[PDB]
């Protein structure tokens, strides 16, 4: 199927109480492979999936250098933005950056992203053409123009089309036995009876990878109504994921509701009627 | 593999 590499950066200022806290993470699909935490011991980019460990010390020294340069730029950014928005030197603020490439089934470049956010709200973002910037805010107009004069987009475009996909492919090869392997959902139904008139049904999918799953309830030709309860997919802790999809039936008759489960791990979509 | 060329201060 399709794949991606994504890095996530977080910088939280710590007014008075030391230097900002900086956290960086890397993913291939829904598997983390690297991390950095400014408040751990190593002060090094650290491995997190087995197959990345295979890279030599040039890689570790390299990625440690760059990640720290990310951090340093964020550390400056927090001082910049505190100015832009007239905020006080006391009180915490947050910078977030995220970037990465997508490839299709043929392992070729589909799309790339580089977005940035200040105190949890969009700030500046590289458009999908990878030549243009989206800047809601006034302060982000300032940033837009500076980055435009700096040809930031031109550099990011390359990375995204080159380094980002090439190495995504290298990682998919090295972690082939796990990254390219699918774990199908183990599914089951359950029936919890709210009121003597009402019954709640939750459709379960367990032990699946990747995270991409769709769970559509039905009463023969029905979908989500402001009733369908579809919770966020969650980590099982072992590298697989879990998700459930509920529906309440004031029916004394749970029929004939169907749960429908779709995943790359199933050769055919599943249909699930209720039991006894 | 992280970005080596392309991160700028805002």
């Amino acid at each position: 199927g399709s794949h991606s590499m994504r890095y996530f950066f977080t910088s939280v200022s710590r007014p008075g109480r030391g230097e900002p806290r900086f956290i960086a993470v890397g993913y291939v699909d829904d598997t983390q492979f690297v991390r950095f935490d400014s408040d751990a011991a190593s002060q090094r980019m650290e491995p997190r999936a087995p197959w990345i460990e295979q890279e030599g010390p040039e890689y570790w020294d390299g990625e440690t250098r760059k990640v720290k340069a990310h951090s340093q730029t964020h550390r400056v950014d927090l001082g910049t933005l505190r100015g832009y928005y007239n905020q006080s030197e006391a009180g915490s603020h947050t910078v977030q950056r995220m970037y990465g490439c997508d490839v299709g089934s043929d392992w070729r470049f589909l799309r790339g992203y580089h977005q940035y956010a200040y105190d949890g709200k969009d700030y500046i973002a590289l458009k999908e053409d990878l030549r243009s910037w989206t800047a809601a805010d006034m302060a982000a107009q300032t940033t837009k123009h500076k980055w435009e004069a700096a040809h930031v987009a031109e550099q990011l475009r390359a990375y995204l089309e080159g380094t980002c996909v090439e190495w995504l492919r290298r990682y998919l090869e090295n972690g082939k036995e796990t990254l390219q392997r699918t774990d199908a959902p183990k599914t089951h139904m359950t029936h919890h009876a709210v009121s003597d008139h009402e019954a709640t049904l939750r459709c379960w999918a367990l032990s699946f990878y990747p995270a991409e799953i769709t769970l559509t309830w039905q009463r023969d030709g029905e979908d989500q109504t402001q009733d369908t309860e579809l919770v966020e997919t969650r980590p099982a802790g072992d590298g697989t994921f879990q998700k459930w999809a509920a529906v309440v039936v004031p029916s004394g008759q749970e029929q004939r509701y169907t749960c429908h489960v779709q995943h790359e791990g199933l050769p055919k979509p599943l249909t699930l009627r209720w039991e006894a | 593999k992280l970005v080596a060329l392309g991160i700028n201060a805002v």
Partner: T-cell receptor
Amino acid sequence: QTVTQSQPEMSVQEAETVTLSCTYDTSENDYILFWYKQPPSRQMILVIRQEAYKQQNATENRFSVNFQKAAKSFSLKISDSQLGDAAMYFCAYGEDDKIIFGKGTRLHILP
Amino acid sequence: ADIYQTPRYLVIGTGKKITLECSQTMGHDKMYWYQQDPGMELHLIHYSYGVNSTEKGDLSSESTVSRIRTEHFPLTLESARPSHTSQYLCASRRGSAELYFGPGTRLTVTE
């Protein structure tokens, strides 16, 4: 070092062509390369600038470069040498940080 | 508008303390301080990502400067020594691309 200019000195007749050599060592694919001129004023001036994702051409002036990524080679070609090309020439490697320079080549131009 | 270095020349005598002004009005974030011996090598001695940011490269004396009220990136050698004798090249950077060097300060420390 990381950027290597293995000829500290070079000399050429007027009106002739010279190729100042540069190689570098990087475990990175994205970066930028530079040539910088420093005549007796000691004022550093950009000569040419090559990003790692660019292709042929540019070039642009009486100075060209022969950039070869796999070779990690970033040669500077100076043709129709004038006496004003007498100067130090530096080759340089750059990332988000840093930029570091090779040791440099002092160029004499024989009239 | 441009990048500036003052003073152009300075003579001091060992043990004394000295500050080299480098200022630049081009809006640039990254700035750098290179030190150049009579043997001509360019040594990265300090740099900076933007205000509050400082980092070293090496070389005794000056090697930290400051960067707050604009950039404005002053080098300071506390207690100068004949070792400090050299050119001091300050430079500003467009983005993560080329550099723009000030004229330089020629510093001689005398016994």
